[PDB]
Design a protein around this ligand. Sequence first.
Ligand SMILES: NC(=O)C1=CN([C@@H]2O[C@H](COP(=O)(O)OP(=O)(O)OC[C@H]3O[C@@H](n4cnc5c(N)ncnc54)[C@H](OP(=O)(O)O)[C@@H]3O)[C@@H](O)[C@H]2O)C=CC1
Ligand code: SF4
Ligand code: SF4
Ligand code: SF4
Lengths: 288, 386, 94, 176, 114, 72, 206, 154, 111
Amino acid sequence: LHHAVIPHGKGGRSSVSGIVATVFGATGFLGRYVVNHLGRMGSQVIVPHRCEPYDTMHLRPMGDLGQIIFMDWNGRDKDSIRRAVEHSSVVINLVGREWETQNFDFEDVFVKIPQAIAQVSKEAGVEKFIHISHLNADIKSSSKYLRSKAVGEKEVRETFPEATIIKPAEIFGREDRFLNYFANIKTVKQPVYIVDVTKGIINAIKDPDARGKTFAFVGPSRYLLFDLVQYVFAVAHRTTRDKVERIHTTDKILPHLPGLEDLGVEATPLELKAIEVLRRHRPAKTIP
Amino acid sequence: SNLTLNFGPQHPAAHGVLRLVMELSGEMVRKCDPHIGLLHRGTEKLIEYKTYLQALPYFDRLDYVSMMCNEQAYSLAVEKLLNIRPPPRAQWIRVLFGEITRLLNHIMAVTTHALDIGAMTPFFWMFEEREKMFEFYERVSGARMHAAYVRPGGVHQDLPLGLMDDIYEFSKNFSLRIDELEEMLTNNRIWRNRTVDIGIVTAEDALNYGFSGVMLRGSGIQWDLRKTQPYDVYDQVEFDVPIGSRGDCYDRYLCRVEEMRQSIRIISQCLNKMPPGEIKVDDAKVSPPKRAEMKTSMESLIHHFKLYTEGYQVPPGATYTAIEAPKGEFGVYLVSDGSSRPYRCKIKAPGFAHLAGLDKMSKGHMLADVVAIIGTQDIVFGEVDR
Amino acid sequence: ASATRFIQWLRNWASGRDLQAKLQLRYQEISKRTQPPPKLPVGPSHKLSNNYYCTRDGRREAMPPSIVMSSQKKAVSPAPPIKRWELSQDEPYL
Amino acid sequence: TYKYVNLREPSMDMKSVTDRAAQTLLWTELIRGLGMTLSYLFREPATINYPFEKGPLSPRFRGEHALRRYPSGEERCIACKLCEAVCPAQAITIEAEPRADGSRRTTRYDIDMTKCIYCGFCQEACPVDAIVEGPNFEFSTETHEELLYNKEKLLNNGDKWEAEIAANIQADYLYR
Amino acid sequence: TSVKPIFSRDMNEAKRRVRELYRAWYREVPNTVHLFQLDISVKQGRDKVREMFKKNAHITDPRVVDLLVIKGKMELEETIKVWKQRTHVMRFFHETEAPRPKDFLSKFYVGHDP
Amino acid sequence: IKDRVLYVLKLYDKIDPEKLSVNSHFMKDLGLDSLDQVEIIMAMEDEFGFEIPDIDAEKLMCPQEIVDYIAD
Amino acid sequence: RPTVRPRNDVAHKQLSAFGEYVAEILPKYVQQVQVSCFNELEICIHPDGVIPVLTFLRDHSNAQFKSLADLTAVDIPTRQNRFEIVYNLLSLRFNSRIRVKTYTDELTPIESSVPVYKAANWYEREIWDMFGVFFANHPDLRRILTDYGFEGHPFRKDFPLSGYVELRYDDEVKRVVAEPVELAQEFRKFDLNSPWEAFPAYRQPP
Amino acid sequence: GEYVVAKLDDLINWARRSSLWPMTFGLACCAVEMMHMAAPRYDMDRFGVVFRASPRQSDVMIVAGTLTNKMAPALRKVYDQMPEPRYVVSMGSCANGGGYYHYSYSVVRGCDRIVPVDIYVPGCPPTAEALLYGILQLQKKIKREKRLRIWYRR
Amino acid sequence: KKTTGLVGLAVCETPHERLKILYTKILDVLGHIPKNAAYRKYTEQITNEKLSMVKAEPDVKKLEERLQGGQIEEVILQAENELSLARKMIQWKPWEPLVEEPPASQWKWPI
Ligand SMILES: NC(=O)C1=CN([C@@H]2O[C@H](COP(=O)(O)OP(=O)(O)OC[C@H]3O[C@@H](n4cnc5c(N)ncnc54)[C@H](OP(=O)(O)O)[C@@H]3O)[C@@H](O)[C@H]2O)C=CC1
Ligand code: SF4
Ligand code: SF4
Ligand code: SF4
């Protein structure tokens, strides 16, 4: 270990965790929890952002002075990718979009961009690579989103064989597009808490076993979609064609893949955190 | 019903933040429970880790409207424990800038009191005068507010050439500015309706509740530390102590306006009686030598080196030293253990006991009166919380 | 300083004062911003003889407190009663 | 000596009573207050045209710090640490060692400008006029980190402002 | 060993006050969870009360017990009168603190602290 | 009474119906602590809607003693 | 002598005489009376005497210390009773100040002096908050300066300068949280005391 | 296309920096210098910075003084209730990073541990002119925003 | 007198009579204190001194000057305070020996 990245302190804000992480997609729902957890323990975080600096301000208080560094980057500019990962020991890719746009389609955000990040990271000598895919990724899905997730999942493994691929179920939390999606409006779902996904990602960085593996992050219980939507409306005291297709895909069961338990994380029940998410909008039987 | 007042008004205000928990029955206030500590910064503990010189700037930041007066109180306490005496010219400078500071405080007290009651305009007129007085601070110390100018042993530097002429030109016109302020307020029937018979306190109660300054004189008590326990050269200037008769907000307002006039009267004598000589005690084991001496004489260099690293040792002892600060009796209970760092420094802020009497003074008044009563006490939470 | 004579009369009448004699804005009456150098005096300890520090050592003249009573006739007050204050002759009543 | 601020007996003769009734009914003292604000309307305002016009300052002004040199270009600071010892905020951090030519010079000289209280004790304490508070006060930044000055920044400040700093010291050093 | 009491002259008198304070805290928890809109359950809140009481169960000085009850009442008054805010109540649970290693090996790996 | 008292005590989580006898001691038999006892009495004050002072509650160490106290 | 503070023997004599006066009248409580070299009178008393002594000084016709200037505490850990309670009183009638001192430890309460001076109300709340001294029969004793839920008494000599916890905003829980204190720059302790004695007049016996 | 988005950004940026309504947290001595910026010599109103602004009508928060632990939750609450766009100016050493009270047990070591900060104004206190320089610097920061340019390229 | 000048302190119509009654009551209360108690000896001495002035001087302005206790209504207030104290002193009995000695180094400064 380079002397500058030997851990020091007691794991707090002013400590040195030894982690130098570049987090692509840090300005999103998942990225704000990952950056927060990295900053809690005194990691150096590089935050390449496409958005206006005004939209990165919520990340500023998450680290001690100097621990959060912001950079401009473009998905299609590899030089900007190289500048961001050049000094990092881990690269985390949280880039994604739940819809397509004129300038970026699902193939751009879930295939071309992840592949470019992984390739430049390997060429830059980056040691660890974390890539977020999706539990229901499949090249036979009715959803173009889930089809692209499968193709990109394959290209990342080919480019960065030692990459740690994580495949979460739909994530619920304060800023999600799951419980909030239902509160604003057959299939079986296994939603997983945002903090559990974040903790698992942080543990995959610190765990040398996670290299080269693919994980499936799922919640404890499986809910029939109808029961889930009724539960949300009760707690709340009350879109695109692709999004509907994804929401109606039954969560794949993959017992061969390691899960949160293998990374030391205890999956949080939905019922414990449902009120937290839905309180601002003011128990489903599981499938054994 | 229970109600909480806002931290501060919606216009710039520099008194700090207060959480006032009140019990009301209709329009009337039945209980007032100030919740302070929102500007508690453990100043008294921090001072124990400083030398006596290093702790002096903390006193600028207590009642941060009366900076040099707070410096004077601390300097007098250390001078007493040191058993030394500042030279006469420094004493006159300290009285001169003590009264300039009183003007600064009374403008802030009177005009923000009016501003919170809704009379915005006088604040703007009189803060131009405050801006000119900030320039006097800056010309002697290099800082507009936290001068750190008055120190044990005297003052840090002599007045620059030409400063006293400018203080004279300012003082020449200031009474007219007070008159304009009185034209707006003194006889105004709306101002009198907001202040007359509001927050009455008896002479007996004022004493037992620990009040001081105008909070005593508004009730007819004939007391002023500059008269009764004079310090520096206050025994050498002539001035009158304004005394109230009704013990209410209006009389206290009149006392503060008249005190401003007496401060001009004192400043006039200071400008004419300023003596020549050195401005800090000619004892280099307490006051650092001149820079030219420090760069030429072996003894001066040693004493400069030691005064700015270890600092002077103060003989063991304890003193309670108080002055007539613009807000009332401001004192320090300073304990020396013989070293160059104070063992204990308790600060007596006049606004602490005044605010503790808010519940007593607000009884039988309406919600809008609570604002007037806070203003008449002239509360700054740097000195309340420390 | 540059107000027209009519405007000077109007604001003088409205205020009831001679504002022009005590303007709150400073012009050329103030001191020059460049001054001649000072030559400051020295204190009374700046002597070449008869100036031994032990004769002017205030700190070393401080003593520990006098112990009047330790647990190891006419009545008195802590000081004479304070003398009643006099009314100002400059202006007793505002 | 004392005076009464509010101890006056209103006269109860008819003329005086009718003066007070006229004031009550005809709002005379309120009109008087309107006269005062009207007179101010026609006064020249006190506002200056910042940033084209600036508030007046004196040579003693305590602004942004800088590290100074001798006329030959040698640094004045000899790492005595008097400024670091006196600093009331512990804002100064210094490390030193013998320079390659044997000189006593600092290898670290940091001022945390967000700890500093801009009191000027460091420049009082300095025996060689090395650390000064300059005249600059317009150095606000967009990040906290930009206000943690290291030695290179402070030396650059000295080289940037020496022309003004030297003249201000020439103006005030006989008062010190 | 002759001292001025605070409130209770012996442990039996002191333990009566402890039980009275526990009763008040026990009944307050449901109101606290509602008033502060806490995401914790009432059982979690009452378990926290028990843990705080249990940690001082070994005291045998009635004066020390009096002070603990005096402080516990002050804490309750802050909570009931809503002088505390949501953050102050949740400070009992240390949610953002990562679990600190307990066994010798875990501590040995992470630093020098015992 | 006795049916109501046992209903609460069975409904108490720390207590199992197996060892809950009408004469069982809350401490020795059921293994409860002093704060568990205070918790039990608070449930009794809820079932019957009246207050039980701490001086009284400190002797009700078995369910039968609670039965007797409620009757009086 | 221009640099030396002048003595005032007249006030030293007056205060000494009044010091004996108070000791003669309250022998049940007065343990020591001293007058400092700068003329300040201190009455050191047994803590049981707080109310009788303060009441006497307030109401006696030869005293009339009607104004409580300040009430504070001092922590001296080496003393069996580490806390020294200091009352600074003022008499407007006789234009004089007196100081009354007593002591207590962590577990021994002091009688509240609110009945004698209403000013004492908040001063005693501050002493309780900052030093942890309990005042018996205080109408409303609770913290006044520290944050709600604050643990410890910061003005005790053995309380660390930066405390034990510090606050920050945490986005995950969307609130301000409290965590164990870590400092980017540790406070730098300085050893300043010269190894040479400064004041012979205060030398303690070996 | 790009031309229309470029000018709309200029218009909205101009409106926002020309109408900056501040919520002042007058916490300690720095608030005094803030009042002097409102006073006639500098008259911040003449730049469009209104004197009296309600927290729910505010575009910029000025943290003028020491932030204690006791006060930190209340400051965050006011920030959270500010409608966007919202900016924070940290004024003075205490707010910037604890200042003279940095090592105190009761003080937040910089308000940027509680809220994001846009401008740091140094000094103890900064002069009224130095604060005004900071507000003018925030205006030029708003002038550089490209919100619609970013949105168009999404 | 129209006013005493101190808020809340009413003027007294019959100050000479009021002081005679108050000083007589104080002397009566002091009789229940032990003869050797310093409080009784001193309080009686000053009380008798003031009572004699009240009897000698029938002019309030000239009596006020003799007593030197402010206005005559301030003297009456102080007499009421002394009487209140005298009654409390009987229950405290501060003339008794020192209740307890301090620890050996209790009042030693510096440490
Ligand atoms: N949330 C869920 O339920 C699940 C999420 N995931 C994966 O987790 C990752 C993030 O989840 P989430 O954070 O919720 O997604 P968000 O949409 O919340 O965040 C998306 C991130 O990707 C960035 N981004 C999007 N498009 C582009 C682009 N064209 N060029 C550059 N940057 C871009 C965004 O930056 P900007 O802010 O600039 O748009 C943002 O930072 C994604 O990969 C998603 O597929 C997997 C399974 C479930
Ligand atoms: S100005 Fe004062 S606080 Fe700032 S570095 Fe110098 S000595 Fe330290
Ligand atoms: S700047 Fe001056 S005082 Fe500080 S270390 Fe250098 S020479 Fe010494
Ligand atoms: S930075 Fe200076 S002026 Fe501002 S609040 Fe802190 S001490 Fe006061």
